[PDB]
Each structure stands twice: as structure tokens, then as C-alpha cells.
Amino acid sequence: GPMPGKSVVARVAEAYPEDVGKRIVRMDKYERAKLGVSVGDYVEVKKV
Amino acid sequence: KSVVARVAEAYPEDVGKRIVRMDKYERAKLGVSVGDYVEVKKV
């Protein structure tokens, strides 16, 4: 059933070269599902 | 030092690995390095 979006803790990995400078983060469907976001949505990232 | 970024899909090889790919500008603005851990939340 529907779950609310939750914060996710993830390990930083380096960007693919075509993505550099585009202010994107690539995250898979499991992280997006837990976050409650779709591709093209915006997220806030903070150090932990 | 929160930074806003747009979500893009994962490369197939990265699916299931609990990573977030971000470039050198984002890492600098966040003050993090590859391998560090970050918290991500929906805007």
C-alpha cells in the first residue's frame, strides 16, 4: 500500500561525465520509492 | 550546506546499491567526498 516519503541515507558516488554541471543526482527506483519522488522531481541533499 | 538537485534515473548497474551519483560541484557545495554519506529528502 501507499507509504509516506522518508529520508534516505545513501553513499556518494562520482557522476557520469555527461551529467557534470547539470545539478542532477542519479538515484534508483528503490531510493526514489522510499523518498516518494519520481524522476524529474527535486530533492535536498545534506551531509550526515 | 543543503543543496537542491533534480532526480535522474539510475544506470542499471547501479540499481540496488544505495548510492547517489553527484558531480564535483555538488560534492563541493555540500563539503562531501565520494564515499561519504548524505541524507536525501524530497523538496
Side-chain angles (χ1 to χ4, degrees), chain B residues 17-39:
Chain B
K17 299 203 304 190
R18 285 167 168 78
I19 67 169
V20 48
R21 291 219 184 257
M22 56 172 50
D23 70 22
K24 59 172 177 184
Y25 305 101
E26 260 60 67
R27 297 197 301 276
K29 283 186 182 175
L30 257 185
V32 307
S33 303
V34 170
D36 284 353
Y37 290 100
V38 298
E39 201 165 49

Side-chain angles (χ1 to χ4, degrees), chain A residues 8 11 16 18 21 28 40-41 44, chain B residues 2 7 11 14 16 23 35 40:
Chain A
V8 303
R11 202 149 150 90
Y16 288 87
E18 83 268 0
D28 70 21
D41 281 352
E44 178 154 48
Chain B
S2 130
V7 177
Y11 278 69
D14 296 311
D23 70 22
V40 185

Side-chain angles (χ1 to χ4, degrees), chain A residues 19-36:
Chain A
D19 299 332
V20 172
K22 299 193 179 170
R23 297 189 67 189
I24 67 166
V25 287
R26 290 193 180 277
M27 296 181 299
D28 70 21
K29 63 194 184 179
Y30 304 107
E31 295 163 307
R32 297 195 304 275
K34 195 166 181 293
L35 288 161

